[PDB]
Design a protein around this ligand. Structure first.
Ligand SMILES: CN(Cc1ccccc1)C(=O)c1[nH]c(-c2cccc(Cl)c2)nc1C(=O)O
Length: 146
């Protein structure tokens, strides 16, 4: 399987799935299928222990980390169900200023982002979306666009 991917058994179904411990992605289908540069967008939910608990959305961000994680989980569910798209949730709900660009961060190489974000970004394939990624900024959903 590609970097970070592992096989596991589901609790509810007994069906096998695949989990990525770098990106926190999980899916039923197998992935079997490194560039200098990637381009991603993201959706950031900040919390009380974020390095900077404020944003364009809220002067003082007070939600707990577990609360942020619950929000992130809700957004992932809507993106995966097709009920909302990534860009629209990012513009609306992301605590990053990149919310104004539908979450787009532009292209970047290794050495630039906080490491858990960088690693998750480089482990995604074009088109692929991460699970909840924790950094000192808060919790991220990352979509690799290029
Ligand atoms: C930069 N920062 C404060 C901080 C300072 C030092 C270390 C970590 C976070 C943030 O909270 C922040 N971090 C990010 C961000 C954007 C892209 C990727 C990552 Cl890992 C963080 N956006 C913001 C923002 O406020 O818009």
């Amino acid at each position: 399987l590609p970097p970070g991917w592992e096989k596991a058994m589901s609790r509810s179904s007994g069906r096998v799935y695949y989990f990525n411990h770098i990106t926190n992605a999980s899916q039923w289908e197998r992935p079997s299928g490194e560039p200098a540069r990637v381009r991603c967008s993201h959706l950031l939910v900040k919390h009380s222990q974020s390095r900077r608990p404020s944003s364009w959305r809220q002067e003082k961000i007070t939600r707990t980390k577990e609360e942020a994680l619950e929000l992130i989980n809700g957004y992932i569910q809507k993106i995966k169900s097709g009920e909302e798209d990534f860009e629209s949730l990012a513009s609306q709900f992301s605590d990053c200023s990149s919310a104004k660009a539908r979450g787009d961060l532009g292209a970047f190489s290794r050495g630039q982002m906080q490491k858990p974000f960088e690693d998750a970004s480089f482990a995604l394939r074009t088109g692929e979306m991460s699970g909840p990624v924790f950094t000192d900024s808060g919790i991220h959903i990352i979509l690799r666009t290029e």
